[PDB]
Amino acid sequence: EQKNAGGVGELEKKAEAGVQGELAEIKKIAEKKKDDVVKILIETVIKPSAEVHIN
Amino acid sequence: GNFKSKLKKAMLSQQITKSTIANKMRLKVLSAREQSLDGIFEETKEKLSGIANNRDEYKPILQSLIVEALLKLLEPKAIVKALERDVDLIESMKDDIMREYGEKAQRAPLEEIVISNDYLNKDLVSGGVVVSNASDKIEINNTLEERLKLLSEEALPAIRLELYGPSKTRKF
Amino acid sequence: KKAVEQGFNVKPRLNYNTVSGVNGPLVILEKVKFPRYNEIVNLTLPDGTVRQGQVLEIRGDRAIVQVFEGTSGIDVKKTTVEFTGESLRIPVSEDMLGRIFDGSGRPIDNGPKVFAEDYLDINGSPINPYARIYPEEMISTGVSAIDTMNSIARGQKIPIFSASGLPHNEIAAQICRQAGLVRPTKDVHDGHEENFSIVFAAMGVNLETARFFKQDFEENGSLERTSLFLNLANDPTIERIITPRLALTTAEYLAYQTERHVLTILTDMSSYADALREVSAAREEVPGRRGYPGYMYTDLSTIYERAGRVEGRNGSITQIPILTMPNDDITHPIPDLTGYITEGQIFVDRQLHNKGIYPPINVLPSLSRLMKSAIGEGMTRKDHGDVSNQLYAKYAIGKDAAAMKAVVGEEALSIEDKLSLEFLEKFEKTFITQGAYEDRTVFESLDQAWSLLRIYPKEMLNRISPKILDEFYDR
Amino acid sequence: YGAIYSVSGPVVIAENMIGCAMYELVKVGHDNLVGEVIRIDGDKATIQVYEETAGLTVGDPVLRTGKPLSVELGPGLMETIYDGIQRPLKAIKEESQSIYIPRGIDTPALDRTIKWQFTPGKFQVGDHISGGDIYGSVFENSLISSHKILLPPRSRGTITWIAPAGEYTLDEKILEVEFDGKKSDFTLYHTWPVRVPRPVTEKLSADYPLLTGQRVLDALFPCVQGGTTCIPGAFGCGKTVISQSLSKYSNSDAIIYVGCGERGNEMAEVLMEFPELYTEMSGTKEPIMKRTTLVANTSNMPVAAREASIYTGITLAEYFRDQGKNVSMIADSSSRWAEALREISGRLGEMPADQGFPAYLGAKLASFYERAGKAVALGSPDRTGSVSIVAAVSPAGGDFSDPVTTATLGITQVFWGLDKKLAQRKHFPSINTSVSYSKYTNVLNKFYDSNYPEFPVLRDRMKEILSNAEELEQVVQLVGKSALSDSDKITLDVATLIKEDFLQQNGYSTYDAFCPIWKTFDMMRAFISYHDEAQKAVANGANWSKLADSTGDVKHAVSSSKFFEPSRGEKEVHGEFEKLLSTMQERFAESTD
């Protein structure tokens, strides 16, 4: 039981480190693609389309 | 027989802790992506505010939004509620807005449109205009912030396919 | 190419303050412009609170919106309704597993939004019958009463009939906790090519037992395979109607696009039926049999038939609806219609429950119609079918002998009956009686059944094939 | 054309529908959803939508088709799986590449891309032609050597142009008529409303037996080509054997399977086993799908589809009867169709009659079942078809007090009474002789006296033997074997031999897959001769136990008589039956000494 408690305490930090690595990779990808995503979103918002709902 | 209860206890009662830790890590992994998307949306909102700040570039966009709002309303009487700034641009180009509405829809051009005295909150709208029907009963919130929110709600799978490639698990 | 969504378009929404009347749980609008029949709308109360509403009726420029969470506080003067222009689409993704959603698709695990791969529409189109293929492999449950004697195939739709107060919710939790695929293989079923998943939907579930489901799944590691759909009893009724549709849409997505094996537990189908009756009477429809509207065989069919395995996809959907029989009768409309639409049924018996047997599954009435497709040589073990048959026969004989034990006496019984009393004792309180957290694989349950059957002699184990009997019973 | 108003599920009030007729199919919305008009009120037409209605706007068009619910009749109908609306499930699957059925899909019922070889008939240019006249034949499959092209009923005139011999598709014009100046263009197919029976020159009396190949059916409870049969559609009962025997070994030149409202995984069985069912009646081994059409409806298929499935199937069967082909129609569960009716009536709000079933359930059932029967087809040349309906009733767990079951049993002349218990005891085909009955025994007297004169007498003798054993088993159980006379033991032994030999047919073997009516008659003569010889010998003072211990060899010969291979030739099998009868007579004569 004591060994399991110590292992859980260490595995909490290990999982935190793994999640930190994954989050760092995700943040890097987001920083890479943010310019393109923002440009696409701005183009979509700033370029509306006329329509009529008769049909 | 008595110790059989604790023989697997270190992996059964600590299984709850391990599962909770794994669930917390999995939820944090998704929350990181959500925070990244929120940052992207904040950058997009700042860029939209900056674009609206340029009146010369704003004017055609503003007329397009007004025309689309009228077509959605689809009535000859309409009331527009814009920001305190650029309230004169709508007054100046309503003559062309009416012609554009009458050309885009086969029906007759709008007889008259009134700029509402209830100016939109400049601290929040940061652009766009909310056109409303006569007696302000029916409205369309064609504001830049509202459009950004609607696009964020709707174009989420497109953003997914943009930042990340197609899901390898989704063979279909 | 996946980049064909074309969702970057922006659709402005019209908001009307033109509320013309309020009638119970529904709001009438007087000047709607081209309303959609099943459109979801957002109501802005005068106090500022926002409520969702689903359009129930569309006349000329008139739309009747049935409002979630009641209609209190709505005035015809200040409230506004925003029309979204789309029905209740839900966000789907491969990582919805491990998420706990409200009955309206809103996550309630304090996590983020779904981050959809696609906004799959609710109550999707029916599976083409020419595309369906027969169920062909067993989905394991960890319950001996179900694994050995009422085995569930991979496309089967098999309900769990129960009643109020019986532990059907805990049985559902156990099944969700221990379900999986049977055959051992070189690669585990947690991979990316042979994977398994569970979609748990709770409708009208009590807050105590909803919290029980949440804590049970988050603590026992079943969450990473489970997308849980909680719906409290005090939650909106339309939310109860849409909850099984959310669960089955997620299951359809996973199984038929990600190619997962998906088990769907729809607990408290009777509460869903009550909600359906409430919705039907909200539209001034006159109630059908037993107050329930006469058309729910269609709706239960739409819920149930969203299952089975299909031609071109390696995935499958297995459904285990769980319904409480009101007043403990099969003649009630809900169990009757479920028996019409579903293959077989599992019975939870009050008599077994009062004796302290868990799970209190009464195996004599319970039946898996297409069990024979889930059992075989490459499917579990070669002795599965005849061991199940022998268990059923000896259990029935034991019940009959227990009836005669108090009528002709213990000593007047035949030797088979004396063996049958003690076989029934050992059966009910060792084999059927399985701990709430005891996970028995199908082979462990099979050899426990064999250990129970080893008390009988060769001559009158007559419902086991002599080849299997001579290969298993004699050592 | 039209527009839309009040929508509450499938009910859809339309606008500007001035020219719409009652029960007329319309295309609803931009997705062209199918739906039929239920009410007309001025320019407003109440349309019940034949599928999901979640997305429908007010004002978007509703186009009226101009026709009621009708089925496209023509070549390409064989070997095709349909729903109640006759939507080609296969063609829907390849066209959409989709697991589901897309909403508003409008693939043609009959394939318009296939080029069919068309051979024109006797009619020439300028000839007067009437409805039902065969003006050409089309080689559809190998089993359907000539899908004869019928002129549609209610249409007639003078032939002004007829396409020559060639290879054609359905859209291409084939024949042209002029009625009174008005000019009509007829193609390789035509559409007929499902709810009006296809007209015939004369409805004949069905008198030729429907040889299912099962000994119990062909002997004790015989159906008739053009007859009507009811079946309990329970699970454990081997109804699959009955359906496969009718679709595999019967006299039918066509088979229509109507899986109305069936389960999802049951229709999977029906759709997956049928492609590998093969026939030898053609002289070459060919699949039965070349001769069979399936109407498949899972319980989630639209209520309108489930209700109209049986009508679509019976209209297809009538179309193939009008060509001169004996067609058998098998309904998976008419109780599911009655449930569909109950849902439709409830949604329309009609007052119920019997625990929710509408007042016209009996009328609809009687009218639908009357469409079956032998009949001389409309038009020339003279020909005779037959539609036999074999419908299975599956009420709530054997609750045969259901008005659906009551009406079906009151209409159908044959009940084959499958039993769960006989399936538990592995006594296939599991026909409960005690409750099963057939009211076509009197009619088939003509056929028997023409071919097998002693057949009715032997059938009645077998009925009496089985009934006597059935009523004597209770006295056996109550009193003991010692109380039985020798003749009663004879009855019991012969009846047990019957149950183990004649009624019980393996079916999955080669000698019992198809027992012909002549081999069946020979076996009846053998069994009745055994019973009569035993009865006579024991009436001549002989103790039955001694004969039973002594005449086990002739009993074994009778037991192996079911192993006679029908493929050996009628003459050879008749000769060996004669040898069996001679041997049994001689051995009884020896043992009675």
Contacts of C273-282 with CB under 8 Å at 24 or more apart are C273/C300, C273/C323, C273/C333, C273/C334, C274/C204, C275/C203, C275/C204, C275/C237, C275/C238, C275/C240, C275/C241, C276/C241, C278/C237, C279/C66, C279/C237, C279/C238, C279/C241, C282/C24, C282/C25, C282/C26, C282/C56, C282/C66
From CA D505, how far away is CA D249, in angstroms rounded?
14
D223 labelled as ligand-binding?
no
Q: From D211, D235, D226, select the one nearest D394 (Cα to Cα).
A: D235
CB-count burial class (<10 Å; 0-12, 13-18, 19+) for D102: middle
Chain D contact set for C123 (CB, 8 A): 52, 54
Q: From C63, C75, C74, select the one nearest C34 (Cα to Cα).
A: C63
Q: From C445, C420, C433, C457, select the one nearest C149 (Cα to Cα).
A: C445
D244 labelled as ligand-binding?
no
Q: Rounded to the nearest 10 degrees, what angle do helices D334-348 and C296-304 cross at?
A: 120
From CA C452, how far away is CA C427, in angstroms rounded?
7
**What does CATH list as the number for B39-165?**
3.30.2320.30
Contacts of D559-564 with CB under 8 Å at 24 or more apart are D559/D497, D559/D500, D559/D501, D561/D501, D561/D522, D561/D523, D561/D526, D562/D501, D562/D502, D562/D505, D562/D511, D562/D512, D562/D515, D562/D523, D563/D511, D564/D511, D564/D519
**Hey, how many other C-beta atoms are within 10 angstroms of the C-beta on D303?**
25
Chain A contact set for B67 (CB, 8 A): 50
Which DSSP category does D501 fall into? Answer: I
Instruction: Decide if A44 touches C, using CB distance below 8 A.
Output: yes
Neighbouring residues of D142: CB distance < 8 A, sequence distance ≥ 6: D282, D284, D286, D290
Tabulate helix, strand, coil % of chain A (nearest 5): 80, 0, 20
C82 touches C15 (CB < 8 A): yes
- Residue C200, H or E segment: strand C196-202
D566 touches D515 (CB < 8 A): yes
Q: Which two tokens stand for residue B20?
A: 């909770």
Which residue is closest to D263 within chain C, CA to CA? C341
Which residue is closest to B170 within chain C, CA to CA? C258
From CA D306, how far away is CA D396, in angstroms rounded?
18
Task: Mark out the alpha helices in C202-332 (DSSP H runs).
Answer: 207-219, 237-253, 269-282, 296-304
From CA D503, how far away is CA C124, in angstroms rounded?
48
CB-count burial class (<10 Å; 0-12, 13-18, 19+) for C204: buried
Q: Which residues make beta-bridge pairs with C55?
A: C65
Q: Spell C12-33 as b/e; 16+ CB within 10 A means b.
A: bbbbbbbbeebeebbbbbeebb
Q: From D41, D580, D50, D40, select the one nearest D301 (Cα to Cα).
A: D50
Q: From C424, C400, C408, C421, select the one nearest C352 (Cα to Cα).
A: C424
C262 touches C255 (CB < 8 A): yes
Those chains having 3 or more beta-carbon pairs within 8 angstroms of chain C are A, B, D
The pairing of beta strand D326-331 with beta strand D384-393: parallel
The pairing of beta strand C261-267 with beta strand C196-202: parallel
Determination technique for this entry: cryo-EM
Q: Which residues make beta-bridge pairs with D384?
A: D376
From CA D453, how far away is CA D474, in angstroms rounded?
35
Neighbouring residues of D225: CB distance < 8 A, sequence distance ≥ 6: D206, D208, D209, D210, D251, D252, D326, D374, D386, D388
Which DSSP category does D49 fall into? Answer: E
Q: Is the peptide bond before C359 cis (omega within 30 degrees of 0)?
A: yes
Instruction: Decide if A4 touches C, using CB distance below 8 A.
Output: no
From CA C201, how far away is CA C240, in angstroms rounded?
10
Q: Spell D178-191 as b/e; 16+ CB within 10 A means b.
A: eeeeeeeebbbbbb
> Within 13 Å of residue C83, how many CA atoms lie on the same side as its CB?
27
From CA C235, how far away is CA B32, in angstroms rounded?
30
From CA D441, how far away is CA D458, in angstroms rounded?
12
D455 touches D511 (CB < 8 A): no
From CA D468, how far away is CA D487, in angstroms rounded?
11
DSSP, residue by residue, C331-349: SSHHHHHHHHHSS-BEEB-
From CA C85, how far away is CA C14, in angstroms rounded?
9
Chain B contact set for A48 (CB, 8 A): 61, 64-65, 68, 142
Between the CA of residue D552 and those of D77, D492, D522, D564, what are the distances in Å? 54, 15, 20, 19
D79 touches D290 (CB < 8 A): yes
From CA D187, how far away is CA D171, in angstroms rounded?
6
DSSP, residue by residue, B51-71: HHH-HHHHHHHHHHHHHHHHH
Q: Which two tokens stand for residue C112?
A: 């983020």
Chain D contact set for A53 (CB, 8 A): 57
Q: Is D530 left (phi over 0), alpha (psi -120 to 50) or beta?
A: alpha
Q: What's the gap between Cα D402 and its chain centre?
A: 22
D20 labelled as ligand-binding?
no
Q: Which residues make beta-bridge pairs with B167?
A: none
- Residue D345, H or E segment: helix D334-348
Q: Which two tokens stand for residue C154?
A: 């991979």
Between the CA of residue C410 and those of C404, C414, C416, C419, C425, what are the distances in Å? 8, 9, 12, 11, 15
From CA D580, how far away is CA C441, in angstroms rounded?
57
Expressed in angstroms, the distance from the first to the final Cα of chain C is 60
Q: Which residues make beta-bridge pairs with C232?
A: C205
Count contacts between A and D (CB, < 8 Å): 6
Q: From D159, D178, D170, D155, select the one nearest D118 (Cα to Cα).
A: D170
Tabulate helix, strand, coil % of chain D (nearest 5): 35, 25, 40
What SS3 state is found at C282? helix
- Tell me which residue has tokens 């603590």: C219
Neighbouring residues of D224: CB distance < 8 A, sequence distance ≥ 6: D206, D207, D208, D209, D210, D374, D388, D440, D443, D444
Q: Which two tokens stand for residue C430?
A: 């060792």
Count contacts between A and C (CB, < 8 Å): 10
The pairing of beta strand D33-41 with beta strand D25-28: antiparallel
Q: Which two tokens stand for residue C458?
A: 């060769």
Neighbouring residues of D344: CB distance < 8 A, sequence distance ≥ 6: D48, D303, D304, D307
Chain D contact set for A54 (CB, 8 A): 59
Which residue is closest to A34 within chain B, CA to CA? B40
D224 touches D183 (CB < 8 A): no
C61 touches C14 (CB < 8 A): no
Q: Which amino acid is at C134?
A: Y
From CA B107, how far away is CA B75, in angstroms rounded?
9
D397 touches D233 (CB < 8 A): no
Those chains having 3 or more beta-carbon pairs within 8 angstroms of chain A are B, C, D
Residues 1-20 (A) with a CB less than 8 A from some CB of B: 1, 3-5, 7-8, 11-12, 15-16, 18-19
- Residue D201, H or E segment: strand D200-203
Q: Is the peptide bond before D381 cis (omega within 30 degrees of 0)?
A: yes
D330 touches D105 (CB < 8 A): no
Please give, rounded to a whole number of angstroms, the shortest distance from the CA of C429 to a CA of chain B: 19
Q: Give ∠ CA B153-B157-B161 in degrees, rounded to 5.
A: 140
Neighbouring residues of B106: CB distance < 8 A, sequence distance ≥ 6: none
D19 labelled as ligand-binding?
no
